[PDB]
Structure formats: C-alpha cells, structure tokens
Predict the structure of ORF40.
Amino acid sequence: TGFHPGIAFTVVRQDRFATEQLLYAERASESYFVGQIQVHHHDAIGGV
Amino acid sequence: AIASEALSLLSNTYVDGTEIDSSLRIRAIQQMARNLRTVLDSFERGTA
C-alpha cells in the first residue's frame, strides 16, 4: 500500500566482456626455420 | 607387417618435378636393399 521497511536484501550481477593486455616480447624470437616442401594433390571428378 | 617404412616411402610423391634428392635416394637405396637382401635370403631358405 504505502510503506517500505528496512529489510536486508542484495543483488548479484555478472559481466561478459573483453580486455587488452601488454607483454614483453624480448629481442630474440623463436628459431622457426623452413625445411623442404610437402604437397598432397588428388583428382576425383571435375577438378583437382 | 610394417607401416612406418611404407608411410615414409610413400609420403613424398614429389612436389612438382624437383631434383632427385640424391641424399635421400642414396639412403633409401641402401636401407631397402639391405632389408631386401636378408628378406629374400630368408624366403629362399624357407622355400628350400
């Protein structure tokens, strides 16, 4: 009707977002070399 | 009954018409011939 007491209550909320971070990449990188060439081709119908 | 050797032998199938890969070809010629010599010797002994 007209009133509002001082009872105890609480609410719970959640969030779902993204964020950006910064790190140290140093100077020397990974020794990712290249070795030979690998291929795989097969023709069944129409094209290859 | 062998699968690793067959997979290694059939995994190349060339790429586009490159060189013969003399080192790999020599290694394969050595290993396959060495295996086949004793394989055929055992087969001949068994048949005899």
Q: What stands out?
A: The two ends of chain B are 23 Å apart (CA to CA). The interface with chain A takes residues 13, 15-16, 18 of chain B (CB under 8 Å).
